[PDB]
DNA sequence: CCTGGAGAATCCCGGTGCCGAGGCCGCTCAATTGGTCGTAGACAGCTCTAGCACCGCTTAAACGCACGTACGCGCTGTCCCCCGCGTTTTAACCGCCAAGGGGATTACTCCCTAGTCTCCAGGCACGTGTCAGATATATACATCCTGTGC
DNA sequence: ACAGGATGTATATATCTGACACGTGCCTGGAGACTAGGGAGTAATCCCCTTGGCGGTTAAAACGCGGGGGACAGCGCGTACGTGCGTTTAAGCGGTGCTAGAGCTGTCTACGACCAATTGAGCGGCCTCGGCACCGGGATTCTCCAGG
């Protein structure tokens, strides 16, 4: 009923037997009014299928009126050199800036009306509620859509309260939490069809609910390459000290406020605390690896790394992690470099071009869980360790697949470190929960 | 070259303006972790309410100011402009510190 | 039958409530016995205070060019007035901010 | 191993800050000591304000400080407080 | 659902209304007026209970609630409030 | 001989001749001592009462009592007052 | 039969009538009900109270080469000590005079 | 009567001063604190009268006027 | 002849009456103008002995504080002599 | 810049008066027993707010700097004002006496208030929508500052 | 001394938004009627304390004078502060993620305080005496002030 393969109006775009039955799909949402969430997360041109359907509304219908792709900051260059290259002809235009910037181009551009699509950051959109709702939109698109997973927020109400005629949601992982979330979501799409709360009388119904409005596929199935990926669950004890701390703060002087967070940072390394660490002097020996359990592990594990292919990728949930492992890599005096949220954005990308350089001296490459720009083509590493494992399995699957992508021919291997009888099991039961309601809602 | 101001006319634009204002001066964070530092000696893990922090600030505020009053009535009793650490201690005798 | 209730904020021309003020008195361990004119009394009294502040507010307000009143309206109705600046002398109006006030000798001249 | 300190909580509360507050009392000139002085005064305050709020919520059997209770404590010291319940 | 929390926001809109019919008021000025009857009735009553307690009595009257307000009040402001509670307890006890 | 009238006399005495064997007292400083006494335990009953209050409670207990010394005395007398206290009821449990 | 009456001043080891405090606070009305050991402790927070005032009055009169305290010696012992300055700072005893105190611009130079 | 605030006298206003702490005065300082004495008075005098005439009486005593330095925030000790 | 200096003889009388503790007001000029002032506020009124006594305690107590204050305030503005300036300066930071 | 004079204050004795300290009397309040009832302690489930470790953006506000200028401060000179002392006048102070109002106590009696039950109607929590009050721009007006001319 | 040139500030106008004012539904406390008890008003009596008056005395105040010291105005100066400007950063906002701490309605239950009647000893009032404080007096030491 529809074209198979790229259409005429997309300049080098190929459409490679994933496109096309995207944007059928898409084109037949539209024509069936229903809005739709696209899921078939990092791996698939998400982008591009968004492109060639504004393309087809554009050329093939002649409503090309108020268009809206909401964005992070972080893609916007990426999107409009796609919207530049894919699809010339639906020129389109893009706010990003200070608030004289933002004077200047309403009063140049978006005000004069010649612009077609216009291209915002999320914090832009709360800035300009009143100069964007002028505008009668035609189609809301929202990548990354686990941002509005919540409602009862700005950005939620916000993107609610605009008038439009339909909406499209790219997202990788809908359901994170619970189906609190996925209904939130629904809500938002359907205005009306979803305004409750509420093997058979589950998996079944949910199914058969969520099919008219949502897509999954895998790389796999056509691509068929890029080996698996075995994870290995090292479970480590603690030190004496380690034990003694666990105790005090597990009992009841320091402050001791969320019991939770305290125990978290103590099943780590107990130097995160005060008063573990020695006197007045600072003597980086001892005072170290050979205190902690998992640091043991660490200096245990990390020589057979050198002695075999290496590159080993560290993931970690707290920047104060990350400066231990700076001060033993130092002590140990190896190769290494520290990205976080706290880098400044320029210094980040350079990092990554230097740890993906044909010859990379550097062995350690330290990254927060969930302080990446949501892309870091970390192609050329083979080990990922998982030092510590958050609430959000979803989290976790997306750190270890940004480093597997395409490029990548060594099978990646991931290692995650758990500390046995303690709350880290109770943090990866959570864990186990959440992702198999997830796999059982929307991988099927 | 450029257009400068005498050194006093600035000054008395933001008293006006500042008398003619109401908000809050200090800024939240800063006051809150002074108050949970203050609270924290005189007992530990103590959790504040959003409105007590307020309160505390408006009550610093409205007794600082105050103070600032009574401060500039005594440098200009001592044939004054500027304002004092005597001046400053001196109200707070007289007040019944 | 049974006469129908007036309430004793109506019977005495009031509108603030007696009754509530009697019970707030007899509750708040003042002294055992409470008469009967007492909370008459004192909801008058709180009536025309009420009233006093309220008017100085407003005619500040109607100054102001605003139709609401707000705690900078109240504290100017409270400032610039004897009787209501002795009364609520140690009083903080929270949003209040102060009364204009420029000492003489810092004026340029 | 790591460390970074930032600075004094009391240094939270900036000289422009403090300049402000003095323009709204109407002070005009300001000398480079009052600064230091003005801390002082305002540490003293807070600590009599927090001890007696602190010794309300004790007796009360709770660890949340309420406005009540700051309310309770400036009106004791004598500093009635309107607007907070 | 929830505790109920009385006040005298209604009491205090009909006298504003009373003595300005266009005007309103905010929320924060109504807390303002809540805490200052509340304020002047504690002050008047703890006035009451202490001269009752001089007196070596144990009935709080009309007499008392007028003594306290003319210790209270300064002076203009205290005459007409004593006329106010004059007029109402008069009103009062008429023929009621 | 008028209405008996009471006060802390005897019991200031003896506190006196306790700390001080030699040392006599005149009837201005017997005034002077008993309307201490008689202003101390007004302001603390008085602020045990509005603690009671505050709490929702209908009792004047040890407690109150405690909490209204430490907020009215300050530092090292609250801490000797609280021990003294503590200890004095610590015996009359005992003893009962 | 009974046996012998026992005071609870004795049962307390104070010198300070808990009966007569405990009648006082019933018949004050600062609350609707009284525990047992609250006279017990306002008791003994005033015996402290006094014990402290008491032996501060007498050192300072023995240091005046007498053997009676008059107020003289009570106002001297009370601002002479920094707590109970502070805790009878707004109070005025008669006939106490004043803390001698001379500027030390005024002095001779 | 009148004329009797002139007997608060000049020597005596010296001897007040001077266990002020005070060595030199001002001849204008008199009148002054006589409008000191006499609003401080008339504020105490004012209260006391209105304890008596709540009690039904016509002589003001010690201890009325000890109820009026006390709600106007000096306390006084040594007079019942 | 034999004169002093002018400032030593003040300083013996501020020893002196600094030492002393006796009244400094006569007391038939106090009690006329405590009468002529009640006159005012009720005619036809007696006092007792005890109420002019605390009066004339209360107000040179008064008296007292307010010229410690008032010499503050004039050392401050280096000067040694006290002005009325520096009464109204004391009364205004007072609070009246 | 030391001397020595002349006042002031300090110290030791002796005599007076009175007020503190002790000893009795009588009653009124506190101690002792017994009974009860409600107030508070303890549990339980719901739901809502605070905190701790972060991240990601944005931008107003803090920070450091240069520079000239009122301003604080020290020093001087003048003058009159306040102080110190002796004289005369005045009124407090003291003691004493008389007279009468008025505070203080006691005995009766009644009316005013606590306490209860019944009914219902005012007041409170909950939604909901519309106007008054921010906010943003472009004018128009008042203030100030310096150079220019006199 | 006076113009004009730049800069902040007020005013009109249009827009938007969220909080205030109103209507609904329901429940709980106030009003009506009744009873019973004692708190307080009312009259009478006493006696204490206030007031009014007088006369002698003596300190205290009023007054005048003379002169040295402090207040006040003026001048100079060199320095700390107010003003404008570029650079850095930390506040403020918007998010996740979870768990406890207290407000809650509901409930149970038990022990601790109120209450009553009896009875006795502690405390206030009254009366009486001795030693401590006070006052007067005389000798010794201290501090200030002029002179050379
Ligand atoms: N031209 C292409 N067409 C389709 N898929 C591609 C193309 N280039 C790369 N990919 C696949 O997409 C993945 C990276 O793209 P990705 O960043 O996931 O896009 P998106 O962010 O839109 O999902 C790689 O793993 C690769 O296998």
Redesign the interface.
């Known amino acids: 009923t529809r074209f198979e393969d790229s259409p005429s109006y997309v300049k080098w775009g190929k459409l490679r037997d994933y496109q096309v039955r995207g944007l059928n799909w898409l084109i037949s949402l539209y024509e069936n009014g229903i809005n739709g969430i696209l899921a078939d997360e990092m791996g698939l041109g998400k982008t591009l299928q968004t492109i060639s359907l504004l393309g087809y509304m554009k050329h093939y219908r002649n409503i090309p009126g108020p268009h809206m792709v909401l964005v992070p900051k972080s893609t916007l260059h990426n999107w409009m050199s796609e919207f530049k290259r894919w699809v010339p002809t639906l020129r389109s235009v893009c706010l990003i800036g200070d608030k004289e910037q933002r004077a200047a181009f309403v009063r140049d551009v978006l005000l004069p009306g010649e612009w077609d699509v216009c291209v915002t950051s999320y914090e832009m959109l709360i800035k300009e509620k009143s100069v964007f709702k002028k505008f009668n939109w035609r189609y809301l698109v929202i990548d990354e859509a686990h941002r509005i997973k919540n409602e009862k927020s700005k950005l939620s109400e916000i993107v609610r309260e605009f008038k439009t005629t339909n909406r499209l949601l790219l997202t990788g992982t809908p359901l994170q939490n619970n189906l609190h979330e996925l209904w939130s979501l629904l809500n938002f799409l359907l205005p009306d069809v979803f305004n409750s709360a509420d093997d058979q009388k589950l998996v079944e119904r949910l199914h058969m609910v969520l099919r008219p409005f949502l897509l999954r596929r895998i790389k796999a199935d056509v691509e068929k390459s890029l080996p698996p990926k075995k994870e290995v669950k090292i479970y480590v004890g603690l030190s004496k000290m380690q034990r003694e701390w666990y105790t005090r703060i597990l009992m009841k002087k320091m402050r001791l406020l969320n019991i939770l967070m305290q125990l978290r940072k103590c099943c780590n390394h107990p130097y995160l605390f005060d008063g573990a660490e020695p006197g007045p002097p600072y003597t980086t020996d001892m005072h170290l690896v050979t205190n902690s359990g998992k640091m043991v592990v660490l200096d245990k594990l990390l020589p057979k790394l050198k002695e075999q292919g290496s590159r080993v990728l560290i993931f970690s949930q707290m920047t104060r992690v990350l400066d231990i492992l700076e001060d033993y890599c130092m002590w140990r005096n190896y190769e290494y470099c520290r990205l976080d949220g706290q880098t400044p954005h320029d210094e980040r990308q350079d990092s990554i071009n230097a740890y993906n350089e044909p010859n990379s001296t550097k062995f350690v490459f330290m990254l927060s869980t969930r302080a990446g720009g949501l892309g870091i083509n970390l192609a050329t590493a083979d080990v990922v360790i998982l030092y510590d494992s958050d609430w959000n399995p979803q989290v976790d699957l997306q750190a270890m697949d940004r480093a597997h992508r395409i490029g990548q021919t060594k099978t990646v291997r991931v290692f995650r470190f758990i500390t046995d009888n303690t709350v880290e099991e109770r943090i990866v039961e959570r864990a186990e929960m959440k992702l198999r309601l997830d796999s059982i809602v929307i991988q099927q | 070259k450029p257009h400068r101001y005498?050194p006093?006319?600035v000054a008395?634009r933001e008293?006006?303006r500042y008398?003619?204002?109401?908000?809050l001066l200090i800024r939240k964070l800063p006051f809150q972790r002074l108050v949970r530092e203050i609270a924290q000696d005189f007992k530990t893990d103590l959790r504040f309410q959003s409105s007590a922090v307020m309160?505390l600030q408006?009550?610093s505020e409205?007794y600082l100011?105050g103070l600032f009053?009574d401060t500039?009535?005594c440098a200009?009793h001592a044939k004054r402009?500027t304002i004092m650490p005597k001046d400053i201690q001196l109200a707070r005798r007289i007040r019944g510190e | 039958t049974r006469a129908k209730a007036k309430t004793?904020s109506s019977?005495?021309?009031?509108?603030?409530?007696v009754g509530?003020?009697h019970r707030?008195?007899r509750k708040?361990?003042?002294?055992?016995?409470?008469?009967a004119?007492?909370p008459?009394?004192?909801?008058?009294?709180?009536?025309?205070?009420?009233?006093?502040?309220?008017?100085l507010?407003?005619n500040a307000?109607?100054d102001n060019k605003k139709?609401?009143?707000?705690?900078?309206?109240?504290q100017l109705a409270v400032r610039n007035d004897?009787?209501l600046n002795?009364?609520?002398?140690?009083?903080?109006?929270?949003?209040?901010?102060?009364?204009?006030?420029?000492?003489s000798?810092?004026?340029?001249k | 191993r790591h460390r970074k300190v930032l600075r004094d909580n009391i240094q939270g509360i900036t000289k422009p800050a403090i300049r402000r507050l003095a323009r709204?009392?109407?002070v005009?000139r300001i000398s480079g000591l009052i600064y230091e002085e003005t801390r002082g005064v305002l540490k003293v305050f807070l600590e009599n304000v927090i001890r007696d709020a602190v010794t309300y919520t004790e007796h009360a059997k709770r660890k949340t400080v309420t406005a009540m209770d700051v309310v309770y404590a400036?009106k004791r010291q004598?500093?009635?407080?309107?607007?907070?319940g | 659902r929830k505790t109920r929390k009385?006040s005298?926001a209604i009491?205090?809109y009909?006298?504003?209304k009373?003595?300005?019919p266009?005007?309103?008021?905010?929320s924060?000025?109504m807390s303002?007026?809540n805490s200052?009857?509340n304020?002047?009735?504690e002050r008047?009553?703890?006035e009451?209970?202490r001269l009752?307690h001089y007196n070596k009595?144990?009935?709080?009257?009309?007499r008392?609630?007028?003594t306290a307000?003319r210790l209270?009040?300064?002076?203009?402001?205290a005459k007409?409030?004593v006329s106010?509670?004059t007029?109402?307890?008069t009103?009062?006890?008429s023929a009621?």
Request: hydrophobic share 45%.
């Open positions: 005498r006093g006319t008395l008293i006006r008398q003619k204002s109401t908000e309160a408006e009550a409205a100011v009053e500039n009535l200009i402009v | 004793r019977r005495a021309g009031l509108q603030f409530p509530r003020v707030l008195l708040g361990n003042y002294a055992e016995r409470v008469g004119g007492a008459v009394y004192l909801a008058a009294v709180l009536e025309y205070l009420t009233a006093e502040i309220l008017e507010a407003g307000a109607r139709t609401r009143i707000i705690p900078r309206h109240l004897e009787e002795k009364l609520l002398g140690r009083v903080t109006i929270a949003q209040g901010g102060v009364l204009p006030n420029i000492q000798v810092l004026l340029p | 709204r009392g109407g005009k400036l004598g500093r009635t407080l309107y607007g907070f | 009385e005298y009491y205090v009909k006298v504003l009373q003595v300005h266009d005007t309103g008021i905010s924060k000025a303002i007026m200052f009857v304020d002047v009735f008047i009553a703890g009451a209970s009752a009595r144990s009935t709080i009257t009309s008392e609630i007028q307000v209270l009040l300064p002076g203009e402001l007409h409030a106010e509670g007029k109402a307890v009103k009062y006890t009621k």
